[PDB]
Amino acid sequence: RSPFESFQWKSDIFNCESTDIDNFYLLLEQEMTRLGMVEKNLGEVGKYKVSLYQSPAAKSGLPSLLISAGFHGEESAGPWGLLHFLSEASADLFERVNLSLLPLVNPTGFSRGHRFNKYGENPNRGFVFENGKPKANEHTSVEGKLLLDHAQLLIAACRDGILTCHEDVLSREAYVYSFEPSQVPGRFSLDLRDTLGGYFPIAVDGEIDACPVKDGLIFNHFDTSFEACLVRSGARVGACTETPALQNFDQRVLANSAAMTHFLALCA
Ligand SMILES: [Zn+2]
């Protein structure tokens, strides 16, 4: 499917269109302000800021975990899923974890309902790991460059876990890419897979790219994506969940919220 094809859904959970970025930010601000989270602006893309939000007064006894969403503008259940999750959270959460968020990496694609940003770039690629260091290549987008410029901040934010919430518009079946320092998947991988399995049928088999999925899982597959790069940079575990964008939008929002919840429980 074309990376400029526009996808839009109605959510009765939020009573709005999935591309309603103005409403998205209004609720995001309210939830961030209620939680006491600190904004760290990384830069701008087409008039929108791309910001990292962080829980205040991080403690070294707690794990530092990063949840990111909205690298691809048509995968809007990720960002709205994050809003859902936050609406159900209290500042008490920050006693269990040092949470950092990238709630919407690709705002220009998100307001248009399409995968690429409005400049025809793919914000989720071009993160190469060379000479023991994260680096850009010719595919790194404006957003990726902003993320790479803050590589040290982001590695620190996700040393104990990186979850990125994606969606697959070509799929009716859920699946998850995971990274664990093991030849075989463990509870981390299997629990996320099962959480999605509670909302959707699972990608029992096939291949996404040259990558085989078995029982909803793609394990330790390294590419030039933000997640793989951060895991190579030192993120102890990583997961990129894929909810199926051919299913009901609010189910995806709830699935994305459940996965974030489970991710935090598994890593805390
Ligand atoms: Zn994606």
Query: Obtained via which technique?
Result: X-ray
Spell out the residues 6+ positions from residue 53 whose beta carbon is closer than 8 angstroms to its own: 32, 37, 38, 39, 40, 100, 101, 102, 103
CA–CA separation, 27 and 16 (whole Å) = 12
DSSP for residue 144: H
φ, ψ at 75 (rounded to 5°): -100, 55
SS3 call for 66: strand
Q: 86 lies in which domain range?
A: 1-268
Alpha-carbon torsion angle 15, 104, 85, 250, nearest 10: 40
The enclosing H or E element of 211 equals: strand 211-212
Q: Enter the resolution in angstroms.
A: 2.5
CA–CA separation, 76 and 115 (whole Å) = 10
- 3-class SS shares of the chain: helix, strand, coil, % to 5: 35, 25, 40
Residue 6 near residue 112, CB atoms below 8 Å: yes
Residue with the two structure tokens 């939680």: 35
Please report, in range form, the residues annotated as the binding site for Zn(2+): 72, 75, 166
Rg value, the chain, Cα? 17
Please report, in range form, the residues annotated as the binding site: 72, 75, 166
Ligand 1 geometric centre to CA of 59 (Å): 32
Ligand 1 geometric centre to CA of 121 (Å): 13
Number of domains in the chain: 1
What is the C-alpha end-to-end distance of the chain, expressed in Å?
38
Residue 59 near residue 98, CB atoms below 8 Å: yes
CATH of the domain at 56: 3.40.630.10
Q: Give catalytic residues, as residue numbers.
A: 242
CA–CA separation, 178 and 235 (whole Å) = 12
Residue 106 near residue 76, CB atoms below 8 Å: no
Ligand 1 geometric centre to CA of 213 (Å): 16
**In angstroms, how far is CA 232 from the centroid of its own chain?**
17
The enclosing H or E element of 103 equals: none
